[PDB]
């Protein structure tokens, strides 16, 4: 009744989808074979007559290795084999490759499979598109797929949980290029974009989880917990129900401004767990601590526009209201002048489940704070000079142009992120 279609594009999208679907299977009790020994699964799984549940997801990639790892792993009998879509040639960190030449047939097939998936849902709350801004598959194919989805499905809430390149640390070289291109692309298609930085999640893992050697599996587990907290009000009842459609109206003040910081709490290992009270007020304070933000973007630089709080577990409205009142009275947290309310509180009675073998502890309370703030303009400011620094002497431009792009496209993308900078400054200023 409340179905949500999940899309996972590129290696990062698929590798966070693995964590997401492990978490959902554990949360609903579905065994990895496919069937479980009411109807809370319908948001993520569609049940067949034999009792086997197949998830409403689509694993899209131009590279065979990542998808074949899923085809060979434990979840080979869960996902639909036609839902797993693999290409032949990788996008090679080339947005033009993943958006103009290789991505065409793959996005056509993905649209067909997504249409088959959406015909199976009575209602449709929206799409959860999981990609990584900074790779040809994630950027190019993600943008192409989102454009086609906007064209055909239309008004459906598309939530893009994108991973943006970190300020200083990075793994690619043309990452600023394809990041700017994908930002230009998805500025006008996705309805709510959630920004994530590997650097910030690494800092979270190092400081709170005490993992001196964080890895992608840990990052994806944290992201999956955030997504499960976000979707908890779809599957499990509780006071202050929130919906995917409510996220848009209570978080996006203007359509251009829809990029969002995300922060989970608590992030504590078992050893340090049950050593602190972890009350509602304290976990809200931790969630609004600048360190717990999963984007390398200090909120103290900007001004909060909206803060949607997602509480899970034994949380009472009296405590949540007292905590948010303390947050409002606190001087360090600063909101814009034109948003006196600026808070979207939601509670739920299903605490987040713990994945065995993970580092997260079993905590009876959880908070996912998703904030629209003008501070996020800082990351765009960083990418805007990282782009033009190489673009001044046209580094790597021949690669992108070789797959059917033009210098005008680079100029247009740069101008659009400049316009986004002006948008952030304008909305921040009185």
């Amino acid at each position: 009744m409340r179905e949500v279609i999940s899309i996972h594009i590129g290696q990062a999208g698929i590798q966070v989808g693995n964590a997401c679907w492990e978490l959902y299977c554990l949360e609903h009790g579905i065994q990895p074979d496919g069937q479980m020994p009411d109807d809370a699964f319908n948001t993520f799984f569609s049940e067949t007559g034999a009792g086997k549940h197949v998830p409403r997801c689509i694993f899209l990639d131009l590279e065979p290795t990542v998808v074949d790892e899923v085809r060979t792993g434990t979840y080979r009998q869960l996902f639909h084999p036609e839902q797993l879509i693999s290409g032949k040639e990788d996008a090679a960190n080339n947005f033009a490759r993943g958006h103009y030449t290789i991505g065409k047939e793959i996005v056509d097939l993905a649209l067909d499979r997504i249409r088959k998936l959406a015909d199976n849902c009575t209602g449709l709350q929206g799409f959860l598109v999981f990609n990584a801004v900074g790779g040809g598959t994630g950027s190019g194919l993600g943008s192409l797929l989102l454009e086609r989805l906007s064209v055909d499905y239309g008004k459906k809430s598309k939530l893009g949980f994108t991973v943006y390149p970190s300020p200083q640390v990075s793994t690619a070289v043309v990452e600023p290029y394809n990041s700017v291109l994908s930002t230009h692309s998805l500025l006008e298609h996705t309805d709510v974009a959630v920004m994530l930085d590997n650097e910030a999640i690494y800092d979270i893992c190092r400081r709170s989880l005490d993992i001196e050697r964080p890895t992608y599996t840990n990052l994806n587990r944290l992201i999956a917990q955030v997504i499960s907290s976000l979707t908890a009000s779809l599957r499990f009842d509780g006071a202050l129900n929130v919906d995917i459609t409510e996220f848009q109206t209570n978080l996006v003040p203007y359509p251009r401004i829809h990029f969002m910081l995300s922060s989970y709490a608590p992030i504590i290992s078992a050893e340090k767990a049950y050593h602190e009270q972890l009350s509602v007020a304290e976990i809200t304070n931790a969630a609004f601590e600048p360190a717990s933000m999963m984007v390398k973007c200090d909120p103290r630089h900007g001004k909060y526009m909206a803060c949607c709080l997602m509480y899970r577990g034994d949380v009472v409205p009296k405590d949540v209201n007292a905590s948010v009142a303390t947050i409002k009275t606190k001087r360090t947290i600063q909101f814009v002048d034109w948003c006196p309310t600026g808070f979207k509180c939601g509670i739920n009675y299903q605490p987040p489940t713990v994945v065995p073998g993970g580092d997260l502890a079993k905590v009876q309370r959880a908070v996912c704070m998703i904030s629209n703030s003008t501070a996020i303009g800082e990351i765009f400011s960083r990418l805007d000079h990282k782009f033009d620094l190489m673009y001044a002497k046209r580094a790597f431009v021949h690669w992108y142009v070789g797959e059917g792009m033009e210098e005008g496209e680079f100029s247009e993308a740069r101008e659009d992120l400049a316009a986004l900078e002006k948008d952030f400054e304008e909305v921040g200023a009185e």
């Binding site: 203007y254 359509p255 251009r256 401004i257 659009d416 316009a419 948008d423 304008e426």
Partner: protein, 84 residues
């Protein structure tokens, strides 16, 4: 010895909505329409102006040649090189 970047515009026989203008034959400006739906009063990019060595909105080929490469061909016969 300078580079004389001239601009010539295709006369749209269908007469589409033309946004370019030339005030004095030197400068050309294009006004991209701001998208009303996308971020109302939150876009801030509408105008793009440039200055060149000449603009030809609608001229015959004779006029185009006379204003484009006559000097270059004259230089060619005066021994200089030329490239259009």
């Amino acid at each position: 010895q300078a580079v004389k970047v001239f601009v010539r515009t295709r006369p749209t026989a269908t007469s589409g909505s033309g946004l370019k203008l030339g005030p004095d034959g030197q400068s050309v400006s294009v006004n991209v329409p701001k998208d009303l739906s996308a971020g109302p009063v939150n876009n801030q990019q509408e105008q793009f102006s440039f200055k060149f060595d000449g603009v030809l909105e609608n001229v015959s080929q004779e006029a185009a040649y006379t204003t484009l490469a006559h000097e270059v061909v004259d230089s060619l016969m005066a021994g200089y090189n030329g490239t259009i």
